[PDB]
Amino acid sequence: MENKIVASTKEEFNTWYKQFAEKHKLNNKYTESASFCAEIPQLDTYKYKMELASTDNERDAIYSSALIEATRFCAPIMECAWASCTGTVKRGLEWFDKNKDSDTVKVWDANYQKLRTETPPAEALLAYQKAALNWRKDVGFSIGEYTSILKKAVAAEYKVPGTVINNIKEMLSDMIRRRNRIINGREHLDWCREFASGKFLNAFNPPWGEINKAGKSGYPLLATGLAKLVELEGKDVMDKAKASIAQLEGWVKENKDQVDQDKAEDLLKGVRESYKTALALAKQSNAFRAQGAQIDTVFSSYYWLWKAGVTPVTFPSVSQFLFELGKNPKGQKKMQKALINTPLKWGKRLIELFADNDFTENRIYMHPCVLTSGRMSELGISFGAVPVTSPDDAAQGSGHTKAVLNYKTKTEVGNPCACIISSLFEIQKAGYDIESMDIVASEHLLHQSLVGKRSPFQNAYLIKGNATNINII
């Protein structure tokens, strides 16, 4: 049981990877990172087999067989190997020994048993999301685009082929409808947007009346207005609002001779109260509670290993387990038996972290540290695409759902990412009742693809904008 991907620095890993890549002839023709993808799999045969299937096990077998076929050869071999390497493994686990007692980790880890049943508070999500960015900085996880924090804007348009466009619009429409269920004075929004975007002198002339006028709810209209702008455009609006209010202070002190200093101070104290009231409403809202529960794949992966008592000695058994798991068409219930039956100790402890039975609320709200049967794909993509005890076996191929994000987005090669996502959705709706399911995996794959997530190992919590507002073309 030796981890054969030996590399304790960025430079030592590159010497391993270039040696591995030129051996196996890794192909970046159809994928974003270099992979074993020599062709785009045509999955329509599974959609038609699914139409004819009668029992639930057959549909599970057809659906998993479709996912294996789709994903087995197209894993990001650079980023997978980087996550699984001896350096990243030792540093990644030991961070939790170093950081468990801090504010950003303890709020969710010490309450793990509570979060298995209950939905988390808003600050526990913010704690998690800070700790994830701390983990990436302290370990030094970024070695390029596909392992970095994304700080980009959401794109205005998303370019899909003509053969799939109709089904992509049905998925997005269902995502819009799902966004509306979790959620549940017209020029005010346009004025509040103008103010936040930089026109700070608007605050002297609020169209409703005084700057701190309360609406029907009893909350300031500037707070309500900024809070609704968070739900429509994203939490980037509150960063812009704080930048505008700073300029308002700068102008009032630059031009004290033009103003009544009492009413200027009553204005600035009023705007700061409405800003904090807008933060309180945004965190309290369901739109944030879903957004904040976004899993950082590799961070939560390493958290679950540390929670199950895994060390650098026992890591290769986990990597080897996840590799073999992604080869056979395995239903989620069969995997639970495999973790029970395996004599290794982590196998038992990892099954006890599952929260499949006892979570009554909507699963989108579940805190992203809690493991489930579906979230084993987060571990599978992290450590399972390349087995560390025998790296060459990767050429066989190990299917993981998060390997679909490695497919290209470019119309030059027919946009294989959108075609696989579209085809997988047709397979799911044919076999399973879609609106009964809380999270549909193909809709979750599309949501990441829309916001510009090109790899499972990227963090994308700090993306400016919404996937909901995008146009399909």
DSSP 282-322: HHHSHHHHHHTT---HHHHHHHHHHHTT--TTTHHHHHHHH
**Cα gap 167→434, rounded to integer Å:** 14
| Cβ atoms < 10 Å from Cβ of 53 | 16
**Cα gap 21→391, rounded to integer Å:** 11
Residue from 296, 217, 280, 211 nearest 245 by CA: 211
**Cα gap 115→358, rounded to integer Å:** 10
Place of tokens 């027919």: 414
The phi and psi torsions of 31 (rounded to 5 degrees) equal -125, 165
| 3-class state of residue 215 by DSSP | coil
**Cα gap 180→295, rounded to integer Å:** 21
What radius of gyration do the chain's Cα atoms show? 24
**Cα gap 361→376, rounded to integer Å:** 20
Contact between residue 1 and residue 346 where contact means Cβ atoms under 8 Å apart: no
Strand partners, 363: none
Alpha-carbon distances of 239 from 14, 196, 230, rounded to whole Å: 38, 9, 10
**Cα gap 303→324, rounded to integer Å:** 22
| 3-class state of residue 214 by DSSP | strand
- Chain centroid to CA 38: 28
Helix crossing, 221-233 with 187-196: angle to 10°? 80
| Cβ atoms < 10 Å from Cβ of 21 | 16
Question: Environment class of residue 88 by beta-carbon count within 10 Å: exposed (0-12), middle (13-18) or buried (19+)?
Answer: buried
Q: Which contiguous run of DSSP H or E holds residue 23?
A: helix 10-24
**Cα gap 406→70, rounded to integer Å:** 12
For the segment(s) 183-289, the CATH number from 1.10.3720.10, 1.20.58.1110, 3.40.50.920, 1.10.760.10 is: 1.20.58.1110
State the number of CA atoms in the 13 A half-sphere of 5 facing the CB: 38
Query: Which token pair is 31?
Result: 């994928």
Place of tokens 């067989």: 65
Alpha-carbon distances of 207 from 24, 152, 211, rounded to whole Å: 66, 33, 9
**Cα gap 202→211, rounded to integer Å:** 10
**Cα gap 419→407, rounded to integer Å:** 10
Query: Which token pair is 406?
Result: 């490695």
Residue from 76, 75, 65, 72 nearest 43 by CA: 65
DSSP for residue 211: T
Place of tokens 């699984």: 84
**Cα gap 26→240, rounded to integer Å:** 44
Residue from 230, 236, 242 nearest 285 by CA: 230
**Cα gap 264→250, rounded to integer Å:** 12
Residue from 383, 369, 371, 403 nearest 315 by CA: 383
Amino acid at 465: G
Contact between residue 343 and residue 321 where contact means Cβ atoms under 8 Å apart: no
Residue from 452, 321, 386, 387 nearest 36 by CA: 386
Q: Which contiguous run of DSSP H or E holds residue 157?
A: strand 157-158
Query: Which token pair is 55?
Result: 């029992």
Query: Which token pair is 162?
Result: 């003509």
Query: Which token pair is 356?
Result: 């499949």
| 3-class state of residue 407 by DSSP | strand
User: What's the CA angle centered on 303, arms 85 and 421, to 5 degrees?
Assistant: 80
Helix crossing, 56-71 with 416-431: angle to 10°? 170
Q: Which contiguous run of DSSP H or E holds residue 12?
A: helix 10-24
Contact between residue 282 and residue 238 where contact means Cβ atoms under 8 Å apart: yes
Collect all residues with Cβ–Cβ distance below 8 Å to 129 and sequence separation of at least 6: 292, 294, 296, 461
Place of tokens 């191929």: 397
Place of tokens 């009668």: 54
Amino acid at 254: E
| 3-class state of residue 220 by DSSP | strand
Per-domain boundaries in the chain: 10-176+293-472, 183-289
Query: Which token pair is 331?
Result: 């239903």
| 3-class state of residue 10 by DSSP | helix
Question: Environment class of residue 254 by beta-carbon count within 10 Å: exposed (0-12), middle (13-18) or buried (19+)?
Answer: exposed
Amino acid at 452: G
| Method of structure determination | X-ray
